[PDB]
Structures are given as C-alpha cells and as structure tokens.
Amino acid sequence: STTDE
Amino acid sequence: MWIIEAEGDILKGKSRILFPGTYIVGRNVSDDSSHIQVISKSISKRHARFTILTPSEKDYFTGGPCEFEVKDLDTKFGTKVNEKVVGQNGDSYKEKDLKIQLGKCPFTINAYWRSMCIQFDNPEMLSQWASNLNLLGIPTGLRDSDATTHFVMNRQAGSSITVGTMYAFLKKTVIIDDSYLQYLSTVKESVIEDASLMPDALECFKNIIKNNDQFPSSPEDCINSLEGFSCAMLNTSSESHHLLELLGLRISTFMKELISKTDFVVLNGIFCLTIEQLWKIIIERNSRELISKEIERLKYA
C-alpha cells in the first residue's frame, strides 16, 4: 500500500 | 515511566508503556517489544523511530523524564512533535508531554511521563536492583528526594523499621518491598498499558502495614500527633526537621532557652530521645492525652 491523504 | 496513547483508533484504543530502548513506529509493523503499529493513510510503512534513553541519577532527584528522541525515517509526509517538524538527525525532548503527529494523520500520538522514582533503604539492595529498574525507565537512589514516589524497605526481619521507612510513611510515599521488585523484574519484554505496575505497588503497601506493629493504620493518624510539644536537635537535616514537623513538633536547631522552653532533645542534664524511640511512642497508646502522655511521662521523670 502506497502512502497518501 | 513513559506512556503513549492516541485519540481515534490509530493505536487500536490501547495505551502502551515505553521502556528505554528503540521503537520503530509505522503503518506496516507489528506490535512487539520494539515496534509500534499506527494505522492511518498518510503514515509511512516504517515512519518514525522513538529512542528513549535510560535515566540519569539526577532524574531521581528532579523527577525529570527519560530523554525521548524522535527521528523521521525519510517519510512522505513528515513527523512533528508538539507542532515542530522533526528535522534530519532527529530531535530530543525532556518535556513530560509530547504530541506526536505522523504524516498528516489527524490524530496525534500522545506521550506523557508518569512520575515514578524509587528510593531504597539499603545500598546493597540498590546495587542489586538499580540496573533492572533503570532499564524500565525508573530512576532510583538512596538519599532523600522530593520526586520519590515509592520506597523499598528492607526485609522486616522481625526487627524495627528504619527512620527512612518512618519518614516515607509520614510523607505519604508508597512503601514497597522485595516481592513487588520481583514483579517488576517480570515486565521488560511486555507490551502493557498505562498504569499497569502502579496498583500492585499500592496493594503491596496496604498488605505490608496490615498486622504490623511497626506501623499504625495510616499516615493520617501519625501526622500532628505531637502538636503542642517542642523539641531540639543538632544540625538537623531538612529531612529530619520535616519529619519532626510532620509530627506537629516545634523544632529549635542548635549548632537557658534551649533547656526550659524545649520539652526534649532529639538525637541523630537534658532529656534525650532518638526518632526510633519517638516512633515507638508515636504508635503505642490511644488518644492525644494517652499516646502523648507516655511522652509526657518520660519528660517529668
């Protein structure tokens, strides 16, 4: 899973 | 000791006691003795390192916290402590309240220091247990401190308690023993929540004074039992002065008014008493005209 808002 | 908790469910609604050592904090990390999982969109998989230093001797006296350090692990959205961005090389904090924001997570990890400093009555006891407690973040010492929360009495080997014990009792310190220390030696590898070790100390204390002819029921009945009386001693330490104050005594410290105004001399043709002897009376009899009548018998004779 890629980090974002 | 250091504790963390958070709002929202980012720490699964749990708190955690953090011991000296290093933790990796992140979204994709499992809660063990050296990792803390914090789940939110904007938190990196491995996000921050928290390093808690072991305590110094000074902290036993000041009540200051173990140094708490935070490094940002080159993350997407950064790390803030108390609204200050953590730079490269990290930051260290000696405040007792830290609000730690990982990324853009709207809920902060709240770290706070709970006071806990353990005084020992015996130097061989201190040397045997100090390293153990220090590794939990618990400062220890022998001498009197205003930051002491707990006092370890020696094995009451069917004998009189020490002045250190009497003093701890009177200033409302929690008195513990060996059996509680054995409990503390259990916990370093554990993941446990806020306040996990504190109530057992109080239970230990309450059990110690039960059926014990070296203690009365409470600090409260001992405090001001000798009001109306006065005394004198040689170079009174501020601790022994405070001890005698707590008994409601009037004290005159020396290096015709030392003699007839003063009811007795406390030590270490005048009438002398040790604190040890004074404690025996401070327990013994019932009322204010009884428990202070045996002391008034020793003066006239």
CA distance B215 to B209: 6
Token readout for B292 is: 């202070």
Token readout for B124 is: 């061989």
**Same domain for B155 and B181?**
yes
CA angle centred on B252, ends B257 and B168, rounded to 5°: 155
Where a domain ends, among B66, B90, B116? B116
- Residue B184 main-chain phi, psi, to 5 deg: -55, -30
Nearest CA of chain A to the CA of B77: how many Å?
A: 8
Residues in chain B: 301
Alpha helix positions (H), B43-162? 57-62, 123-134
**Same domain for B89 and B33?**
yes
Q: Which helix (H) or strand (E) holds B220?
A: helix B219-222
- Residue B118 main-chain phi, psi, to 5 deg: -110, 120
Residues in chain A: 5
CA distance B32 to B24: 10
Q: Indicate the number of domains in chain B.
A: 3
**Same domain for B149 and B95?**
no
Q: What is the CATH number of the domain that holds B258?
A: 3.40.50.11080
Q: In what order do the strands lie in the sheet with B48-52?
A: B35-37, B21-26, B48-52, B68-72, B91-93
Where a domain ends, among B217, B241, B256? B217
Q: Per the CB < 8 Å rule, is A3 touching B103? A: yes
Boundaries of domain holding B202 = 117-217
Closest residue in B to A1 (Cα) is B45
For this experimental structure, what is the resolution in angstroms? Answer: 2.2
Contact list in B for residue A1 (CB cut-off 8 A) is 27-28, 45
**Same domain for B96 and B143?**
no
Q: What is the DSSP letter of B170?
A: H
The crossing angle, in degrees rounded to 10, of helices B275-283 and B238-246 is 20
**SS3 letters for B5-68?**
EECCCCCCCCCEEECCEEEEEECCCCCECCEEECCCCCCCCCCEEEEECCCCHHHHHHCCCCCE
Count Cβ atoms below 10 Å from residue B274 Cβ, excluding itself.
Answer: 12
How was this entry determined? Answer: X-ray
Token readout for B29 is: 């990390």
**Same domain for B66 and B16?**
yes
Token readout for B126 is: 């201190």
**Same domain for B190 and B252?**
no
Q: Which of helix, strand or coil describes residue B100? A: strand
CA distance B60 to B139: 5
Nearest CA of chain B to the CA of A4: how many Å?
A: 5
Nearest CA of chain B to the CA of A2: how many Å?
A: 8
Q: What is the CATH number of the domain that holds B164?
A: 3.40.50.10190
**Same domain for B110 and B12?**
yes
Residue that is written with structure tokens 């002065």 in the block = B241
B46 with B73: CB under 8 angstroms? yes
